[PDB]
């Protein structure tokens, strides 16, 4: 019996079948309910945003609206996969540092609302490390709603050393929307935010040295690149292409006092005892859509090398498919001949 693999993202759900090398269903983690009264999920809800109120049930990777989350899972099983959840094992992912009470609520819903026969809950960052072929490393997982640095030793996350950033892709989308007002663009609506998100993914990159890139981008127009809006107008973006993702390293750009992602990775490694830090520094694994910027790995290598003791050998790993590395790790794990020994069955749960 083939397990179903569901990665519950703040921004997008990734869903598919164990044994596939990529999720067959990717859709926005959005629930729309009538403005004047039924629920619509994902892409359906975005096309009917005029008659619906749109909500995000997963905030910063944590489920915070359980009624709407159940609509998302129902949509995943019935409208995306067309699978009977009561007839498949299910691997669900959870954020690092997800409270045990949240896990238990998700377990209760899977077993008592969807009647799943067996399930396993996996930590997202751990699945990404496995998908990179590693048992030890530090995973930098940056999604739409949350970023985490997760040290992992010999297969197990070190909870005391995990660090969490509210800074992720949605903040960078909003920051691009903001700084584009310097050129006269006024993107503000929810639908225009989607367009800006796409502008961000197509045109942004991470500077190797921000100050030097400001200088070279000022000296000519080579920085400028174009993007065709859906109405056919062409937009031109200049140094916004690298100033937007620069917030990952300088959250003060966003009005945040938080440490940037290089500092956070360094602090996370320092929480682990000295004897395993070299294995972490040599296995910094990038995960998630917001790590997809061109230039991230070379820039991260520079900045962590500056911070870390010079005896440490810094190695930043940027897997090409890292956008879905969580889901792929879940696909591998739940295909293994030993998966049936790791899961919790409905009969066990119902009699606990």
């Amino acid at each position: 019996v083939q397990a179903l693999v569901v990665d519950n993202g703040s921004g997008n759900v990734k869903a598919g079948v164990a044994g596939d090398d990529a999720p067959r269903s990717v859709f926005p983690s959005i629930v729309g309910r009538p403005k004047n009264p039924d629920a619509y999920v994902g892409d359906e809800a975005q096309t009917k945003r005029g008659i619906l109120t749109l909500k995000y049930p997963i905030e910063h990777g944590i489920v915070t609206n359980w009624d709407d989350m159940e609509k998302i899972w129902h949509h995943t099983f019935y409208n995306e996969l067309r699978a009977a959840p009561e007839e498949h094992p299910v691997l669900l992912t959870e954020a690092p540092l997800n409270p045990k009470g949240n896990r238990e609520r998700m377990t209760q819903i899977m077993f008592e609302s969807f009647n799943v026969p067996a399930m396993y809950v996996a930590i997202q960052a751990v699945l990404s490390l496995y998908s990179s072929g590693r048992t030890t490393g530090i995973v930098l997982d940056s999604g739409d709603g949350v970023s985490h640095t997760v040290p992992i030793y010999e297969g197990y996350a070190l909870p005391h050393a995990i660090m969490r950033l509210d800074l992720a892709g949605r903040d960078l989308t909003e920051y691009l929307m903001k700084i584009l007002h310097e050129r006269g663009y006024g993107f503000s609506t929810s639908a225009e935010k989607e367009i800006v998100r796409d502008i961000k993914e197509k045109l942004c990159y991470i500077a190797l040295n921000f100050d030097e890139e400001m200088k070279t981008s000022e000296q000519s127009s080579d920085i400028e690149k174009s993007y065709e809006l859906p109405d056919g107008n062409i937009i031109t973006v200049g140094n916004e292409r690298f100033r937007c993702p620069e917030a990952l390293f300088q959250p003060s750009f966003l009005g945040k006092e938080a440490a940037g992602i290089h500092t956070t990775t360094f602090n996370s490694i320092k929480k682990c005892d000295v004897d395993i830090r070299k294995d972490l520094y040599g296995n910094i694994v990038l995960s998630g859509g917001t790590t997809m910027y061109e230039g991230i790995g070379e820039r991260l290598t520079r900045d962590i090398t500056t911070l870390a003791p010079s005896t440490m050998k810094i190695k930043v790993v940027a897997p090409p498919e890292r956008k879905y590395s969580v889901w792929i790790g879940g696909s591998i794990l739940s295909s293994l001949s030993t998966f049936q020994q790791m899961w919790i069955t409905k009969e066990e749960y119902d009699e606990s």
Partner: protein, 123 residues
């Protein structure tokens, strides 16, 4: 804990090699020990008998330059599961084709060698 190959793991001093094949751990014919398919990933358990009479365990997972992502992911995961089954007492080592530790090289008197090919991906 119920996988047949887990039940055989680490009972006696010696060298045990499994290859990842279609999301399973499959024992490598002993005649082929030392020769690794570059298209594949393997798990290697070295068991040593101490003066104590207790056993020390070293788990290496070896990744070929052309092995597929299901094979290297499964090799990592199986390595963790075998360690757990061994009560957490194995030391885990990641071995990349052409950059293997001298400990791992030292397990094979004829040296490490590589072959073209491999078993098909599970993906």
């Amino acid at each position: 804990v119920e996988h047949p190959e887990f039940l055989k793991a680490g009972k006696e001093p010696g060298l045990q090699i499994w290859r990842v094949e279609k999301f399973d751990l499959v024992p490598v014919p002993p005649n082929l020990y030392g020769d690794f398919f570059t298209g594949d990933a393997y798990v290697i358990l070295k068991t040593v008998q101490l003066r104590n009479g207790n056993l020390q365990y070293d788990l290496h997972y070896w990744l070929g330059n052309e092995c597929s992502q299901d094979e290297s992911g499964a090799a990592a995961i199986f390595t963790v599961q075998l360690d757990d089954y061994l009560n957490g007492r194995a030391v885990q080592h990641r071995e990349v084709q052409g950059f293997e530790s001298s400990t791992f090289s030292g397990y094979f008197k004829s040296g490490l060698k590589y072959k073209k090919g491999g078993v098909a991906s599970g993906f």
